[PDB]
Structures are given as structure tokens and as C-alpha cells.
Amino acid sequence: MIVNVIQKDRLKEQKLQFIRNHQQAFDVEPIYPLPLFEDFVTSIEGDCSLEASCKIESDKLIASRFLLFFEDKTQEWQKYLHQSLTFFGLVENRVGVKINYSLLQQFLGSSFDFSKVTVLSAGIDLRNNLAESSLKMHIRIKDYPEKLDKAFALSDGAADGNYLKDFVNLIGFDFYFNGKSEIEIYAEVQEDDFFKPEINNLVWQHFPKTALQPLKASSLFATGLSKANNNPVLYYHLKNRQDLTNYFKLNDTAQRVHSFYQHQDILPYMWVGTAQKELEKTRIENIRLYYYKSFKM
């Protein structure tokens, strides 16, 4: 019992330190309402992972971006959904905003099979303009084609064709503080399929050569489709975060983020998100960088 007590206190502080390391590196003052997210993270006592990320827009650095991934092996997905939504309601109460839950509600419908969930995450992207701040949720589903159909319908034309359903597992939800909400569909290709002729025909031939080059360093490729996106966002799951500079031509702001994270006590892998047009340039100006740490008893 005493071992569990010590460990619970240790993991609580480690999670807060990971959040604070990120915040303190990039934002001299924490963006409100970060402490509410910190309270939520604290309240999750089982095994989890945290994502800390930066969104670079030329010299603009957006860094109050965090996600918690529920990773307790009990697979209690409905419990985790309700914990996340409790946090969302707490945000509504403290900040004095009303969130638009309609895309999530329609996706879940009235008979959601939680045994088909493989990933659930919840978090924040906080801004100095309240209206531009958002809460975030992602749900990954497996063998649930009914829900893929619904997500594509909810996309309002963003999720291009029905051939993409073959590639979709993760569904994302953004909930802006102004009551605007968005859905995102992520079409993915796993590393084991990169060299298959079917993938060259359905996927690779519709991309320029520059979009294919980082695949060499990636375990997974994805494209994020949403009407909130100006362009489709290409995502690369780099096996080793040290390979970022070898495959992506970074501007000064992104290099700053890269440099900070090289020697932090974090997981080896990362995600990189960028528009197709950025990879055609001599230097990327718009990029998202996502880093990870796990917390296990």
C-alpha cells in the first residue's frame, strides 16, 4: 500500500513538471485556464501519457497545447469519456463559456460501443484571445464502420471520398470557447504498408516527391482532414525526434523548440504536422511539433 501512495504522489508531480517545463520554456506567464487542465491531469490516477506541442506560424509560437492519453490497461473508455467531459464542464463554469458538444453527441449517438475504442485523449489549446481557445478530444475506433460513416457525414465535405474510410481510425473534436466546434478525420498509413503497390496507387502518387521523403524516418503517416484546416495537414510519426532536422527544413522558431526538446527526459518518438506546400519550400514556415512522456505506476 505504501509503495502505491509514494508512486501516486510521484506521478502527480512528474505530470505537473512535464507541463511546467513546456510552459516555462515558451510562455513566461501561463495562459489561463492552464491550472484547470493541471487539476484534470492530477485527478487521473491510472497510467497515462501526456502530449506537449507547439504550433509555429512564421515567428509566432503557440505553446499552451497539451493532451492527456488514457492508458490504464482496464480499458474503461466510458469512464474516461465522462472524466474528460466533467473537466470540460468545469472549464465552462470557471471561464463562463458554453461549449458546443453537437459534433461529439452526434458521433457518439445513442448506442456507442466503447469496446471498439483503442485511444482516448483530452486536452487544450489555450490562447490570449478567449474566443480562439479550445478544448480537444480524440477517439480512435477499430472495426466500427457505422461510426466512420457518421464522422464522414459530420465533416461537411472535408473528408474527401468514401475510399478514405479504408484509412481512418482516429476522429478528432475541437471545442472553441466561442461556441464554434469542429471535427477532424485522420487517414493513416502504417509503416508495414509503405512499399505496397495498393498504397502507391491509392495514396503516394497523389503526393509530390517532397511529401514522400520523411517516410524514411517515420513509423506512421497521416493526413488530417477538417474544414477548420486551410490545407490538409500531413503528419509524420518520427521514430526518433533527433531526426527532425534531417528531414524537415526548420525556421528559427521551430529550431528553438527542437533544441529545447533534444535533451529533455521524454519519449524517443514525436509527431510532425505540416501542409504539403511547406515541404515544397526551401524552408518550412508553418509547422506543428508534438512531444510525449508516459507516466506508469
Ligand SMILES: CC(C)=CCC/C(C)=C/COP(=O)(O)OP(=O)(O)O
Ligand atoms: C495515428 C494518428 C492519425 C495520430 C494523430 C497524431 C497527431 C499529431 C494529431 C494532431 O492532433 P490535432 O489535429 O488535434 O492537433 P492541432 O491542434 O495541431 O490541429
Ligand SMILES: [Mg+2]
Ligand atoms: Mg487538427
